[PDB]
């Protein structure tokens, strides 16, 4: 309680803001996971299937394919060091879209649109 040890961890023992944020994040991603953003988050709700979409180039592009579900799940898995891990992979999932695809692409189209929701979401997160 009230420790100045913030080198290896920014958090106290863990989460002064984080898990509150993640919890925010989830409601924020699971927000994106809402059937409203699922016009523009659903290639994100789930991972890149490189054998599916016909990628094969993928492993050139997509090192760390992120998707809503994954930053959602990691979020909920509490891999999320905090929201900045949340919005990290939300945007990384927005990235895997941009890296692979042209920025006029449907997936990237979501990403920028999810960026309307997500980042607005993200901004209403804790921090205090």
């Amino acid at each position: 309680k009230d420790v100045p040890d913030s080198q290896q961890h920014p958090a106290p023992e863990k989460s002064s803001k984080v898990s509150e944020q993640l919890k925010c994040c989830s409601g924020i991603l699971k927000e994106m996971f809402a059937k409203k953003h699922a016009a523009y988050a659903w290639p994100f709700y789930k991972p890149v299937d490189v054998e599916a979409l016909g990628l094969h180039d993928y492993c050139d592009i997509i090192k760390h394919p992120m998707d809503m579900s994954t930053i959602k799940s990691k979020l909920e898995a509490r891999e999320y060091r905090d929201a900045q891990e949340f919005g990290a992979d939300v945007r990384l999932m927005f990235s895997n879209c941009y890296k692979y695809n042209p920025p006029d692409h449907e997936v990237v189209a979501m990403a920028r649109k999810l960026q309307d929701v997500f980042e607005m979401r993200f901004a209403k997160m804790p921090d205090e």
Binding site: P43, V48, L55, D57, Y100, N101, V107
Partner: peptide, 13 residues
């Protein structure tokens, strides 16, 4: 290689 592919979205064809 050259990025000929993209994440194919909805087989409309």
């Amino acid at each position: 290689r050259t990025y000929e592919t993209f994440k194919s979205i909805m087989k409309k064809s």
